[PDB]
Each structure stands twice: as structure tokens, then as C-alpha cells.
Amino acid sequence: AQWEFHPGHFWMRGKRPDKIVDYDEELQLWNVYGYPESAAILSNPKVFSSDTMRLDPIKLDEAIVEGDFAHTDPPKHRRLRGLVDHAFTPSLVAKMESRVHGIIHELLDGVEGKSQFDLVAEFAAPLPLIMISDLLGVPESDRALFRQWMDKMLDGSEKVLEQEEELHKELELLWEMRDYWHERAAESRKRPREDLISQLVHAEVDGQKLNDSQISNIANRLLVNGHLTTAMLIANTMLCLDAFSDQDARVRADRSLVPALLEESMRYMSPICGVGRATNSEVEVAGTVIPKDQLLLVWTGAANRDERQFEKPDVFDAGRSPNAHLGFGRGIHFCLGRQLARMESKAAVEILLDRLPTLRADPANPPTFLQVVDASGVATLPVVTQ
Ligand code: HEM
């Protein structure tokens, strides 16, 4: 029934926010919790900028953030995202679709003799890492390297002298990743393959193109945005199914519900539950006037429990309609990979139900939750096969 969430994620413990907007004196930032406010904010990029680092001293060199459109505003955002969407071709997308079943089955074969395991480590996490890697065109040998990379990034996210300390740590890993992708981009310029790096290298739009530094930073962004949130979606869903057994029977009796189940999992336990914005001018949100050049955190996780928007918000309802949650954001930064996340997670859940029909969450070994402030979800999920 009840679990051990990040201490900041009060909405997961059923608490309504005391105020729609408030200010954190210690961290010197603003929080927004309401759904219609969060939605208006995300829809208003010209006052609520995604260029958060302009507030944060010290700044990464331009070559390091070059092309990362998740932190860019229009008009440059429109151009960068345009080139990357062009490179996400219908061919590449269908290729991932045609592969997803075989990869799921291969993973599940690797635990066919185990009675107890961690669903995250054995399945929910490797599946989207393998899919995003395959998309980008990475050899099989290198996906261990990606695992190590993400592990490093999570350890830091969980954890002027110390201002420079953290700087070195972050840069040394981005250097390594950038150098990896530059080599891929260079190879694919000479001999293009059937993958996203090759499409990013040849993408041309009116009639702009990307250089290898931009391409490398884009690949890094897709990598970090891709797999861990998808892993949490899959694992959070199986956890919810385990805890709400009526919904479990409901879904097993009606496999048509799985797409709506995943959307309800998105809403109820949001893998990304907060996104950062910076204000360009003075604004009034709800009642509160927020000053210029302020960091604002938009808590999509909390907004997804807002009763002004959702009837019975703290009920998990596997067939919930309507369900316009903010799990993938809203507006111009609307999650670029959401169809891929939905495709992967649907296939994972469908096959889990069929192949491990007596699967249950390990009662002797409770789930651990990711202790990262802006992600709500399972870090480990011990399960038993019988
Ligand atoms: C359950 C899975 C996922 C969740 C919950 C998720 C969530 C989000 C959210 C909330 C945003 C918007 C952030 C903001 O407004 O500041 C976003 C953006 C993005 N996501 Fe996802 N995402 C998921 C999967 C993926 C996947 C699989 C990919 C790539 C293959 C991906 C790539 C991106 C990219 C590139 C953006 C940036 C779009 C932009 O700024 O224009 N995401 N995602």
C-alpha cells in the first residue's frame, strides 16, 4: 500500500499543497504545484525560459552545451528540435518497433531459472538502454560503457572550491561521452549506417545542419533522457499492479487497458516529476508575484494530483479517462521520445503479464525509490516469480 518516496515528494503521500506557489529561502528558488498554473507556465516559454544555466554560476563552456535543445529557447529551439525530429525517421522508429519483442524475450530468458530477482536491474533498466543504444547505432560491446556512464551520473545526481569540485566531476564525464560520439559521427560521415547518428550527420533543414559537437551533445541528451525514465515507467507500473490487485485482474482480463495503464502510471508516479524554468521578467502566478531572473521548479508530479484537474486524483485507475497528465511536459519541449517510451513500455508490460503470470513484489524485500529530487520512481524492485 504505502512506500518510501523521496522526502520532498509530498504529493505521493497524499498531501495537498498548502500554496500553489511558494519560495524556498535556503535554496533560493520557487516551487509551483498546481496543474492549471504548471500548464500555463510550460505553455509560455517566452517568459518561462528553459535556459536554466544562465542563472547558475559557473557556466559550462558553450562547446559542452551546444545543440542541447532541452535548455534552449525559441527561435533557436525550433531549429535544433526540427533537425533532430527530421533525423528520427519513420524507418528508424519502425526498426526499434520490429526489435523490441526479441529483446524483451531475450532479457526474460536470462532470468528464467531465478525465483527471486530485481526487476529493475534484470529487466526494466536494460531494456530501454539497449533500445536507445540500438537507435543511436552503438555496438553491443559498448552498452556496458553506457551503463557505467549512467551509473556515474546517478551517483552524482544523488550526491568556489566545491563549486569547482563538482565542475571537474561533471566535465570529465561529459568529455569522455562527447569524444565517444565524435568518433561515431566521423565514421558515419565517411560510411553512413542505418542509425540516428548517421541521420543526424546528414540531416539538413532550410538549409541548416549540425556539426559534430552539437550532434554529440544531442546524443548525450537522448541517452540521459531516454532509458532511466522509461525503466521507471515500466517498473513503477509493475509495482502499482502488484499493490492494486483489483486493477491487476482488470488489466489481465483486458489487455486493451495497457496503454491507459501506462498513462495512469505516468500520472500517479511521474518518472520526471519536476522541471526547471527561469523567469525572464516579473510574473504573477496564481496570487504570488515572482521576480525576474528566478529559478522556478514546476512540479508536474504534484500537478498530476491536482483535484481541480483530476477526479479522485489519489486513486490509481488503470483505465482512467480523461488523463491529460503532465508526465511528458507540455508545449514546445513536449517530450520528443514519448511514443518510443509508450511503445517500449507497452510491449514490456504485455509480455511480463504473459510470461511471468505469478510474478509478485518481494514481501521480504521492499522496493527502494530513486532518491533524486526530480524523479519519482522505483530504483530497485525485488520480485518473486512464484
Ligand atoms: C517515460 C519516459 C520519459 C519521460 C517521463 C520523459 C519525460 C520528459 C519530459 C517531462 C520532458 C520535458 C522537459 C521539459 O519540459 O523541460 C521530456 C523532454 C524530452 N524527452 Fe523525454 N521522457 C521520456 C522518454 C524519453 C525518451 C525515450 C527520449 C528519447 C528517446 C526522450 C527524449 C526527450 C527529449 C529529447 C526531450 C527534450 C525535448 C525538447 O526540449 O524539446 N524522452 N521528456
By alpha-carbon position, which residue is closest to atom 43 of ligand 1? 335
d(CA 120, CA 282): 43
Q: How far apart are the first and last CA of the chain?
A: 20
The three three-digit cell numbers of residue 213, written as one number: 559537437
CB burial string 149-168: b at 16+ within 10 A, e below? bbebbbeeeeeeeeeeeeee
Q: What is the bridge-based pairing of β-strands 48-49 and 275-279?
A: antiparallel
Contact 53, 71 (CB under 8 A): yes
d(CA 250, CA 248): 5
Cα(224) to centroid(ligand 1), Å: 9
The residue behind cell 528520427 is: 88
| CB contact set of 206 (below 8 Å; sequence gap of 6+) | none
| CB contact set of 357 (below 8 Å; sequence gap of 6+) | 252
In the chain, breaks (C-N over 2.5 A) are found after: 159
Q: Where are the domains of the chain?
A: 1-386
Angle 339-343-349 (CA atoms, 0-180°, nearest 5)?
140
> Which atom of ligand 1 approaches the CA of 329 most closely?
10
State the burial class of residue 294 (Cβ atoms within 10 Å of its Cβ: 0-12, 13-18, 19+): middle
> Which atom of ligand 1 approaches the CA of 277 most closely?
16
CATH number attached to the domain at 1-386: 1.10.630.10
CB burial string 15-43: b at 16+ within 10 A, e below? eebeebbeeeeeeeebbbbbbebbbbbbe
The three three-digit cell numbers of residue 117, written as one number: 530477482
d(CA 179, CA 163): 24
Residue positions in the annotated binding site? 77, 81, 225, 277, 333, 335
> Which atom of ligand 1 approaches the CA of 50 most closely?
16
Contact 265, 237 (CB under 8 A): yes
Write the CA distances from 3 to 7, 367, 375, integer angstroms: 11, 8, 15
The residue behind cell 558553450 is: 62
In three-state form (DSSP H/G/I as H, E/B as E, the rest C), the secondary structure along the chain is CCCCCCCCCHHHHCCCCCCCEEEECCCCEEEECCHHHHHHHHCCCCCEECCHHHHCCCCCCHHHHCCCHHHCCCCHHHHHHHHHHHHCCHHHHHHHHHHHHHHHHHHHHCCCCCCEEEHHHHHHCHHHHHHHHHHHCCCHHHHHHHHHHHHHHHHHHHCCHHHHHHHHHHHHHHHHHHHHHHHHHHHHHHCCCCCHHHHHHHCCECCECCCHHHHHHHHHHHHHHHHHHHHHHHHHHHHHHHHCHHHHHHHHCCHHHHHHHHHHHHHHCCCCCCEEEEECCCEEECCEEECCCCEEEECHHHHCCCCCCCCCCCCCCCCCCCCCCCCCCCCCCCCCCHHHHHHHHHHHHHHHHHHCCCCEECCCCCCEECCECCECCEEECEEECC
Partner residues linked to 383 by β-bridges = 117, 361
Cα(291) to centroid(ligand 1), Å: 28
Residues at CB less than 6 angstroms from ligand 1:
50, 69-70, 81, 132, 221-222, 225-226, 229-230, 233, 271-272, 275, 327-329, 333, 335-337, 340-341
Write the CA distances from 169 to 7, 213, 225, 334, 360, integer angstroms: 26, 20, 20, 30, 39
Q: What is the bridge-based pairing of β-strands 378-380 and 48-49?
A: unpaired
The residue behind cell 491529460 is: 324
Cα(190) to centroid(ligand 1), Å: 31
d(CA 252, CA 254): 5
Contact 204, 210 (CB under 8 A): no
Measuring CA to CA, which residue among 239, 235, 231, 237 is closest to residue 2? 239
Backbone CA torsion sign across 119, 336, 170, 52: negative
d(CA 10, CA 17): 8
Residue positions in the annotated binding site for heme b? 77, 81, 225, 277, 333, 335
Backbone CA torsion sign across 39, 45, 49, 51: positive
d(CA 208, CA 154): 35
Cα(335) to centroid(ligand 1), Å: 4
The three three-digit cell numbers of residue 334, written as one number: 513536449
Write the CA distances from 180 to 81, 169, 193, 198, 295, integer angstroms: 22, 18, 16, 14, 33
Experimental determination technique? X-ray
Cα(115) to centroid(ligand 1), Å: 34
d(CA 293, CA 49): 10
Write the CA distances from 315 to 12, 18, 265, 287, integer angstroms: 11, 20, 11, 29
Amino acid at the residue 180: Y
